[PDB]
Design a protein around this ligand. Sequence first.
Ligand SMILES: *CCC(=O)Nc1nc(NC2CCN(C(C)C)CC2)c2cc(OC)c(OCCCN3CCCC3)cc2n1
Ligand SMILES: C=CC(=O)Nc1nc(NC2CCN(C(C)C)CC2)c2cc(OC)c(OCCCN3CCCC3)cc2n1
Ligand SMILES: [Zn+2]
Ligand SMILES: [Zn+2]
Ligand SMILES: [Zn+2]
Ligand SMILES: [Zn+2]
Ligand SMILES: [Zn+2]
Ligand SMILES: [Zn+2]
Ligand SMILES: [Zn+2]
Ligand SMILES: [Zn+2]
Lengths: 262, 260
Amino acid sequence: PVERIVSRDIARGYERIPIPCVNAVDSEPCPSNYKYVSQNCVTSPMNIDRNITHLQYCVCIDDCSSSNCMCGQLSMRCWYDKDGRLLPEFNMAEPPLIFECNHACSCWRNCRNRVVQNGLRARLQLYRTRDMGWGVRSLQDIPPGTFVCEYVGELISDSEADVREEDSYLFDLDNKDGEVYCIDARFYGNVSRFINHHCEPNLVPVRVFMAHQDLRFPRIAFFSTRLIEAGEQLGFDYGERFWDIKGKLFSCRCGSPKCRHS
Amino acid sequence: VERIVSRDIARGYERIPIPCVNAVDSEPCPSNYKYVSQNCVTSPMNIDRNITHLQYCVCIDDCSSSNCMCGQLSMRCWYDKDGRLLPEFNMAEPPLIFECNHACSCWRNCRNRVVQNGLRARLQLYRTRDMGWGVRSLQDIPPGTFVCEYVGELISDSEADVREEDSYLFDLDNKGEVYCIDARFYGNVSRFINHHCEPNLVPVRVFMAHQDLRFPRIAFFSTRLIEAGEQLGFDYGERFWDIKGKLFSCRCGSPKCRHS
Ligand SMILES: *CCC(=O)Nc1nc(NC2CCN(C(C)C)CC2)c2cc(OC)c(OCCCN3CCCC3)cc2n1
Ligand SMILES: C=CC(=O)Nc1nc(NC2CCN(C(C)C)CC2)c2cc(OC)c(OCCCN3CCCC3)cc2n1
Ligand SMILES: [Zn+2]
Ligand SMILES: [Zn+2]
Ligand SMILES: [Zn+2]
Ligand SMILES: [Zn+2]
Ligand SMILES: [Zn+2]
Ligand SMILES: [Zn+2]
Ligand SMILES: [Zn+2]
Ligand SMILES: [Zn+2]
């Protein structure tokens, strides 16, 4: 049916590569019931601790590949290799918190411990499936352990989340505490909001701290669990809380043997 | 000979390196401050970052139309196709510049964005015989270019009264509750720009990602062609000289020096 380019860039140039939208299935236009934003935003205020003196920082004189780098130690160790990919020892079943370097450290902007703060770099594409509606695919091969994209959106309270109509776009940051917050990508979001569910996922979310270290508000970075080849769709485990509510209304269709919710 | 005491005082945090050189005495590159490329805070500030409180344009072109809402808030958009200020721009009393932001419909490359794209000109911190440290340009800079931003620590006027050094403060006023940029403890290369009574730089107040009028950002635009090798400088104003004029006199070397 030929692939028509319905959008040249859904980000309007706000990323370092364009994210085009294409449709070779049906009649839907490029989605527009939302505002694309490349970084997290807020409506009602959040008291994010942006005190520069409250930041923990390293004092390294190298490229922050030493074991002495404080930011690596906060991360148990620096999990990035020279190419920006996670080392094989990284346990993607129970990922650790990643503390990248910040503006209070002594290192240079090109130190090893900086990956997510460099933005989205893979060439991705929003496309229409016959299956689950919209999905996101990669246009060239992605090696294992590469940072792909961040789950960005509007930061709200768990209270403000309970009183909003649709929950299909929430992502939860720490319920294992007292006060909890989430990211609602319904009204504002990025390309991550179109990433579909998968029972054998090629992406895992990791909690990362960069410019601040308010542990109430981590940022969600998706890394590749294996090699993603050109044309492969992306996806991640939406978690059992998605399905303990929305398995009532429909089935999953990741369409692969080891499915757990079809 | 000219000693290079640092290849980049920003440690790669800017688009170009800002090296530091000394060809006078033997003092090393300054280190009693923390270099930061964007404003920072110590005590918290209630900067209104509600995305829905932003005013935005809905243009379908590159925001060179006269209909751009962000140009109207600025009286008009003062940027030409090259990102320079138009000749009509009044550098005696500059107006508030509202660039486009993440709430507008335009693309990231629209005409109405200059300061939000960062530093571009080749600058260099250098040791003078006379003024201590200064900033010079390594390239010709056409009139109306954005050169650098005055960045530092955002403080209240109350907090500024109780501080020891006041020679690094910048006033951001709406007069009421006023706020200031103190570049003493945190700041960028702007903290080293010397005063000049015939300045080749003027500060303009710009709003980009937030439009809280208590915190405008301060952008330095060239008032004329700045030739390769020339030293940067802006008018500190009378509030600085009514104070520090009692202790020393200006040594800018201008035949029209008003604080000699
Ligand atoms: C922020 C605290 C929190 O856990 N919020 C939350 N709630 C829901 N469910 C409903 C409950 C009541 N609803 C109405 C009655 C108002 C509103 C919300 C919720 C549901 C999910 O799945 C449907 C969900 O998901 C988890 C992550 C799934 N992927 C992550 C990225 C996109 C979706 C999260 C939910 N969070
Ligand atoms: C900005 C805080 C504020 O809110 N008001 C305030 N206060 C000052 N000094 C106080 C200090 C304390 N002192 C007693 C209480 C001892 C009382 C006065 C200021 C001093 C200034 O330089 C002398 C000044 O220069 C602005 C010109 C531009 N800059 C940029 C680069 C250098 C010059 C502005 C000042 N602004
Ligand atoms: Zn380090
Ligand atoms: Zn560090
Ligand atoms: Zn580092
Ligand atoms: Zn499935
Ligand atoms: Zn416009
Ligand atoms: Zn605009
Ligand atoms: Zn615009
Ligand atoms: Zn003078």
